[PDB]
Amino acid sequence: TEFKAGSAKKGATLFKTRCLQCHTVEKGGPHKVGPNLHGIFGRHSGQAEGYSYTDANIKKNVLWDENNMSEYLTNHAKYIPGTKMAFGGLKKEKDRNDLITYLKKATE
Ligand code: HEC
């Protein structure tokens, strides 16, 4: 519901030191461990260019937004339970705030 911020600087590296392991910034990346985002902030859940999300996640589709994504970060699968989970726990708002700060800057 409410969006919090802090510093994109660290948030930019947070993605590189965490999401990079599974997600790739390049659009249509190899999708090794999981599908690659980059630009999905303005798309519905389940829409990808290289690898489509899991049929379960694809069954459920929701428009993405900085506010909507904030809730998803709390749980790799909140409104989209069909989506798989595997993140340590970005429950800390400090990481989630700076994280999206960089993603929003790019989508900006
Ligand atoms: C591998 C162990 C992962 C790491 C580490 C991160 N994510 Fe992930 N993420 C992973 C999977 C398995 C999936 C979906 C599987 C499928 O194919 O459906 C996801 C999905 C997301 C999404 C959902 C958005 C959407 O496309 O609908 C987001 C926004 C997301 N992941 C963000 C994200 C960030 C911020 C990470 C770094 C902090 C991160 N993921 C790491 C697997 C893995």
State the binding site for heme c. Answer: 19, 22-23, 85
Instruction: Report the CATH number at residue 80.
Output: 1.10.760.10
Say if residues 68 and 83 touch (Cβ distance below 8 Å): no
Length of the chain: 108
- Pair of tokens at residue 65: 């937004």
Residue type, position 79, single letter: Y
Domain span holding position 87: 1-108
Beta bridge partners of 44: 63
Pocket test of ligand 1: the residue of 37, 74, 78 to mutate, having most ligand atoms within 8 Å of its CB, is 37
Distance 102 CA to ligand 1 centre (A): 16
31 Cβ contact list (under 8 Å, min separation 6): 24, 48, 50, 51
In the chain, how many domains are there? 1
Q: How far is Cα 66 from Cα 24, in angstroms, rounded to an integer?
A: 19
Type and span of the H or E element at 68: helix 66-74
- Pair of tokens at residue 38: 């980059």
DSSP letter at 63 equals B
Say if residues 41 and 69 touch (Cβ distance below 8 Å): yes
Distance 15 CA to ligand 1 centre (A): 11
Say if residues 89 and 5 touch (Cβ distance below 8 Å): no
The label of the residue with tokens 């990808």 reads 48
Output the CA–CA distances (angstroms, integers) from residue 38 to 16, 33, 59, in the order listed. Answer: 13, 15, 21
- Pair of tokens at residue 1: 């519901």
Task: Count CA atoms within 13 Å of residue 23 on its CB side.
Answer: 20
Distance 34 CA to ligand 1 centre (A): 7
